[PDB]
Ligand binder design. Structure first.
Ligand SMILES: Nc1ncnc2c1ncn2[C@@H]1O[C@H](COP(=O)(O)OP(=O)(O)CP(=O)(O)O)[C@@H](O)[C@H]1O
Ligand SMILES: *[C@@H]1O[C@H](CO)[C@@H](O)[C@H](O)[C@H]1NC(C)=O
Ligand code: NA
Ligand code: NA
Ligand code: NA
Lengths: 277, 985
């Protein structure tokens, strides 16, 4: 009977409309507590993860230099990421500022407020990533057999890395360490045999320093600092044993930087490389 | 082994057993025999060991699903551990499932064992009595004290205590259903008839009851020696019965299991399509089955029965079947018997009618002789009739206490007449000794009179004095003359008018009236040596001499009127079916409340309007008083019409067959009937009725055996209490089912949202399993302890087919209101967690593919930050834990709102049921153990939660409570409206 069907359907219509209204109202009342500039908590992200650009599936880099298709995907991924680091895209001056090529103290651009609008960002030049920038050598070192991986630190909003103090040097001591404004990053062999057969490793950072400069921090969060360019570190493994499953572990050292056994990509990462013959 | 004295004559009985035929064995002989023979108790058969019941309880209900799920989880753990280390989570989940199924089985076993011990202990103190005769005196002793060789007298209604060889049977009929199989009246004869022990009628073989008459027997076998003890078939114990509530629950569990199977199949197909691991999808399948099925429902029904059995035990009652309570709670017609149930069953002579005059008497504490003169010839003849036709005898050895305190093992009316004759005249025993008796017909309901043949010792030696008593109307119709002033004269209209007006005066007080007459058989017709046969008519039964009437006070019980008022308030039709005259029955019904105030029958309407009875239409009369003959000559269609168109019905002058006809017609009206009876005449009605009720004291052994329930307190309010307990059982089961069905949607919905909208998985397999095993086991049991509401007995009886335990409206409510609201609260807390960590609600759309991609360790959130895969899986675990906590709090709200159906929580009380708070505290404990244990070390998709995430869903729980209270309030304020019709479950 339609006379009662209409009434019960009407009751259901108002009932579900009221339920949806309560749900939406509660969501909105929650969202007024959410800031658009600074996240409420950083429990899960505060220690930034350390990742690489080639974007390899199973933490494996497998390619034969003879066959271009073996490293075609890796080269395409690297160039696709590096498209935004070309000097053509950094030509603008209203948003991009040219800070010095020598590492310096982290620069504060103000508190996270809608006032002052969009902030300015330092420009990162590709020529600093020599031998792996692609400007001098297209397709990087995959043709010759000298793979390049670009190492980046995961973006954390309002994060200021603290490099290790001079008194306590957990990493390899260096005359050129320059700890006040460089976050050290070192790639070593995973185990004894890989350490023996890893070969020479050379690092390309700003001004020949090994790690991430500190003036590129803190990140302000895609709304005050869109088109942000995080510092990059290039690692080339030069000569390594052929037809060998070499495992490489790259680690970032610092006071804020932390490590966990559960998260294998927190403050460090693992790469497996075998160059087929 | 077949060695009996069936063919052996009565002469050897005295010599073989050394017991007298009448006096019997002496007390000293009984003492020595008791220490040598032993008690008369059958060997209790070994049914099943406790370990078998215990294992059955762990394999009873839905425990098979839990066992299979645990086995599959352990197999998956073994498979994944064969390859690599894998995760140590399937073994722990299986351990939890095994622990919970073991705990549920243990609880169910403990509850059913407690119920079984309670029912056995409260069905075992009732003793079987035997009327043994020792030293020419009869004393009532328990059947366990019976020995071999003694003489036992058994009449109608009492079960035969042992293998007795009958030596004196007067038309006695026995039911050999336990022996042969037939319930037909089997006549008994003293003479040896058949060579086979079973076929002969000179011996009864225990486990049988006498249908009518009296029988005297000699015990031959006791215990396992008798035929019923020889055969392995159980005389009593577990019968054949399946309660309709079991059918309803079994149908509900079947349909929910089927729907759960469809759901797990469809989710398993979708999960395989979405590229899950096979073992993971199988565990998800198992979680889908476990969550949907109502585990603990059988435990809940066991708890309800175990509680209500004890609740009726507090009211001093006996229930044979644990689930007869459910049938009693749905009773719509109560066919009660006036004498022995509605009244005190204690009676005293108060008024007497002879010589066209009503004589009053002192009810109690007379302390003086009667007012009326005893020298009158008419009263002397009446006293002689009372003394002769009566068979009652005072209890031997008790002639020191007053007359009323002395007990008799005969008819109650016979007892009262014996007391009156003893207090007004000399010893009745001496009169009976002087008046030699040759043959006598015991009172039977079919005849409605008692027939006796006596040898006259008067100078006018007629030698055959036929004295009868019984129904005044039949006796008057069988009498063509009445003695007035000691002189016989033909019956005239003046005597009839005086008798009728005196009878109305007696009946106006609700008193019972009996008729008494005598006649002297002529000497020419019957010589001194005459052979009398029961079948042969011989002496005429007509043209007797009327004498007068005697009135009998039968006061009712004090609490019966309140019980009747409650029953009529609950929509139960009370029908009085008695063998008394219509006038007294109507007076008693008016006094107690069977016939309501201002309610009148057709005769009352005709009297008050002074119009012809036939001219009066039948519709204006709301009450009727139907005689036995009118019902006897009444077709089934007419009886159905009579029961349909009348509110209050009183049946008078009824026979056992008439009671059976009434019961079967009331059944034909598709109504559940409860019949109360105490005598052997009530057995067919007791068996045919849906619920059988018998009196603890006034009831007979046959009535106790046939009844499905026994009132050891002998009050009508016990029936009201039993109906209330049944209604409470139905309400509590409905509440438990409604609560259980709520949580199905909060578990199924998140996976659907995950598949469709692409949000990261709001809930996992482990979290669904833990919600099931921590929110839908203990509270479901706790709802079985809920008390009855205030409107429990103000509701109409539920129709068997119209009203069902799980109707579609209950499922609609439980799924589409509470389930959806709980899911909305859980999703609110999920969105709160994700937004506070950095992922806004809009960014979570279609984020599923990138979320679980292990390749992407730099997922960009709404603020531009990059997230590692493990970090966002930890975020997923936190969201799942918050969803679990929200669902648990909303289940607290659902449990609060599910303990009532009409009244508010303020009327019922928040802390009345402490087991509700036990379950809530258990949920608090398990939530803390899950969030702070196994969350500090994140193993089972659980992590520690911040303090604010516990209180996010509290407003939604309060909203659930407010909405349910508003619905109940609008139902209460507007009964029978659209809201009441469509929003009531
Ligand atoms: N001991 C007795 N002696 C003589 N007449 C008796 C009697 N007991 C009953 N009657 C008569 O037999 C008639 C039939 O009544 P009946 O005995 O069938 O009612 P009832 O008392 O068995 C109903 P219930 O058993 O349910 O209380 C009555 O009218 C009564 O006068
Ligand atoms: C790296 O750069 C140096 C010059 O800075 C060059 O001599 C060398 O050949 C390069 N190595 C490779 C493997 O490209
Ligand atoms: Na369940
Ligand atoms: Na629930
Ligand atoms: Na459920």
């Amino acid at each position: 009977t339609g006379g009662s069907w209409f009434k019960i359907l009407l009751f259901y219509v108002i009932f579900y409309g009221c339920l949806a209204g309560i749900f939406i109202g509660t969501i909105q009342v929650m969202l007024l507590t959410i800031s658009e500039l600074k996240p409420t908590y950083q429990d899960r992200v505060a220690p930034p993860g350390l990742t690489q650009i080639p974007q390899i599936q199973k933490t494996e880099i497998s390619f034969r230099p003879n066959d271009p298709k073996s490293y075609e995907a890796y080269v395409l991924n690297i160039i696709r990421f590096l498209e935004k680091y070309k000097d053509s895209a950094q030509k603008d001056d209203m948003i991009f500022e040219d800070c010095g090529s020598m590492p310096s103290e982290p620069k504060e651009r103000g508190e996270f407020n809608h006032e002052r609008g969009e902030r300015k960002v330092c420009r990162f030049k590709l020529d600093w990533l020599g031998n792996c920038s692609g400007l001098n050598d297209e397709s990087y070192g995959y043709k010759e057999g000298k793979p390049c991986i670009i190492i980046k630190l995961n973006r954390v909003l309002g994060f200021k890395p603290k490099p290790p103090k001079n008194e306590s040097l957990e990493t390899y001591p260096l005359t050129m360490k320059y700890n006040p404004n460089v976050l050290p990053v070192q790639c070593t062999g995973k185990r004894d045999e890989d350490k023996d057969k890893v070969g020479n490793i050379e690092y390309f950072g700003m001004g020949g320093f090994y790690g991430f400069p500190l003036q590129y921090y803190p990140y302000y969060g895609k709304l005050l600092q869109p088109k942000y360019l995080q510092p990059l570190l290039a690692v080339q493994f030069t000569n390594l044993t052929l037809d060998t499953e070499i495992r490489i572990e790259c680690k970032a050292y610092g006071e804020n930087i932390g490590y966990s056994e559960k998260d294998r990509f927190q403050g460090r990462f693992d790469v497996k490389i075998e160059v087929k013959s | 082994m077949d060695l009996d004295d069936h063919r052996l004559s009565n002469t050897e009985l005295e010599q073989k057993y050394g017991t007298n035929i009448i006096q019997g064995l002496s007390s000293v002989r009984a003492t020595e025999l008791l220490a040598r023979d032993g008690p008369n108790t059958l060997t209790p058969p070994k049914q099943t060991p406790e370990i078998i019941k215990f294992l059955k309880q762990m394999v009873g209900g839905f425990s098979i699903l839990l066992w299979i799920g645990a086995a599959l989880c352990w197999i998956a753990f073994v498979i994944q551990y064969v390859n690599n280390s894998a995760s140590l989570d399937n073994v722990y989940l299986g351990a939890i499932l095994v622990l919970v199924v073991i705990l549920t089985g243990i609880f169910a076993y403990y509850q059913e064992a407690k119920s079984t011990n309670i029912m056995a202990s409260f069905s075992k103190m009732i003793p079987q009595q035997a009327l043994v005769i020792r030293d020419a005196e009869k004393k009532v002793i328990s059947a366990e004290q019976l020995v071999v060789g003694d003489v036992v007298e058994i009449k109608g209604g009492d079960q035969i205590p042992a293998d007795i060889r009958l030596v004196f049977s007067q038309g006695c009929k026995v039911d050999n259903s336990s022996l042969t199989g037939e319930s037909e009246p089997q006549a008994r004869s003293t003479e040896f008839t058949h060579e086979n022990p079973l076929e002969t009628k000179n011996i009864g073989f225990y486990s049988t009851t006498c249908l009518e008459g009296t029988a005297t027997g000699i015990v031959i076998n006791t215990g396992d020696r008798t035929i019923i003890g020889r055969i392995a078939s159980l005389a009593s114990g577990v019968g054949s019965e399946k309660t309709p509530i079991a059918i309803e629950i079994e149908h509900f569990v079947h349909i929910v299991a089927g729907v759960a199977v469809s759901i797990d199949i469809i989710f398993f197909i979708t999960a395989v399509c979405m590229k899950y691991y096979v073992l993971d999808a199988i565990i998800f399948l198992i979680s889908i089955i476990v969550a949907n099925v109502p585990e603990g429902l059988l435990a809940t029904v066991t708890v309800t029965l175990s509680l209500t059995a004890k609740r009726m035990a507090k009211k001093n009652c006996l229930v044979k079947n644990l689930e007869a309570v459910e049938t009693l709670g749905s009773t719509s017609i109560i066919c009660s018997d006036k004498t022995g149930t509605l009244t005190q069953n204690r009676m005293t002579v108060a008024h007497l009618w002879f010589d066209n005059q009503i004589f009053v008497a002192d009810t109690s504490e007379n302390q003086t002789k009667q007012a009326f003169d005893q020298s009158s010839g008419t009263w002397a003849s009446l006293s002689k009739i009372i003394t002769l036709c009566n068979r009652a005898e005072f209890r031997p050895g008790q002639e020191s206490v007053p007359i009323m305190k002395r007990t008799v093992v005969g008819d109650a009316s016979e007892t009262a007449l014996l007391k009156f004759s003893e207090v007004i005249l000399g010893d009745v025993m001496g009169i009976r000794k002087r008046n030699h008796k040759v043959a006598e017909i015991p009172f039977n309901s079919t005849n409605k009179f008692q027939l006796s043949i006596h040898e006259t010792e008067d100078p006018n030696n007629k030698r055959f004095l036929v004295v009868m008593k019984g129904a005044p109307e039949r006796i008057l119709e069988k009498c063509s003359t009445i003695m007035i002033n000691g002189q016989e004269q033909p019956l005239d209209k003046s005597s009839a008018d005086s008798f009728h007006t005196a009878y109305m005066e007696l009946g106006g007080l609700g008193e019972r009236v009996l008729g008494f007459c005598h006649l002297y058989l002529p000497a020419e017709q019957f010589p001194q040596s005459y052979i009398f046969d029961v079948d042969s008519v011989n002496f005429p039964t007509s043209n007797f001499c009327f004498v007068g009437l005697l009135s009998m006070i039968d006061p009712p019980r004090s609490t019966v009127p309140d019980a009747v008022s409650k029953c009529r308030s609950a929509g139960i039709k009370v029908i009085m079916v008695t063998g008394d005259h219509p006038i007294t029955a109507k007076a008693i019904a008016k006094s107690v409340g069977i016939i309501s105030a201002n309610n009148e029958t057709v005769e009352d309407i005709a009297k008050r309007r002074n119009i012809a009875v036939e001219q009066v239409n039948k519709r204006e009369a709301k009450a009727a008083v139907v005689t036995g003959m009118e019902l006897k000559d009444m077709t089934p269609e007419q009886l159905d019409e009579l029961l349909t168109n009348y509110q209050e019905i009183v049946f008078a002058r009824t026979s056992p067959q008439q009671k059976l006809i009434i019961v079967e017609g009331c059944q034909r009206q598709d109504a559940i009937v409860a019949v109360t009876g105490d005598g052997v005449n009530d057995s067919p009605a007791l068996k045919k009725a849906d619920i059988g009720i018998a009196m603890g004291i006034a009831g007979s052994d046959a009535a106790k055996n046939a009844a499905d329930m026994v009132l050891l307190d002998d009050n009508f309010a016990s029936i009201v209490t039993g109906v209330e307990e049944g209604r409470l059982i139905f309400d509590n089961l409905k509440k438990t089912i409604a609560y259980t069905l709520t949580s199905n949607i909060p578990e199924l919905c998140p996976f659907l949202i995950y598949i469709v909208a692409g949000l990261p998985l709001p809930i996992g397999t482990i979290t669904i399993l833990f919600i099931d095993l921590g929110t839908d086991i203990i509270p479901s049991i706790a709802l079985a302890y809920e008390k009855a509401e205030s409107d429990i007995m103000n509701r109409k009886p539920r129709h068997k087919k119209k009203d069902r335990l799980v109707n579609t409206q209950l499922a609609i409510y439980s799924y589409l209101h509470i389930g959806l609201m709980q899911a909305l609260g859980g999703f609110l807390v999920y969105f709160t967690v994700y937004a506070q960590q950095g992922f806004w609600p809009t960014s979570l759309i279609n984020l599923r593919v990138a979320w679980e991609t292990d390749d992407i360790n730099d997922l960009e959130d709404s603020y531009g930050q990059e997230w590692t895969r493990y970090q966002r899986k930890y975020l997923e675990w936190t969201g799942s834990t918050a969803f679990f906590v929200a669902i648990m709090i909303q289940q607290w709200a659902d449990l609060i709102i599910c303990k009532t159906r009409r009244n508010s929580i303020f009327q019922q009380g928040l802390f009345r049921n402490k087991v509700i708070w036990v379950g809530i505290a258990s949920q608090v404990i398990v939530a803390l153990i899950l969030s702070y244990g196994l969350g500090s070390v994140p193993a089972l998709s659980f992590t520690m939660l911040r303090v604010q995430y516990w209180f996010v869903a509290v407003p939604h729980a309060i909203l659930i409570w407010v909405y349910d209270e508003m619905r109940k309030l609008f139902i209460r304020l507007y009964p029978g409206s659209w809201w009441d019709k469509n929003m009531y479950y």
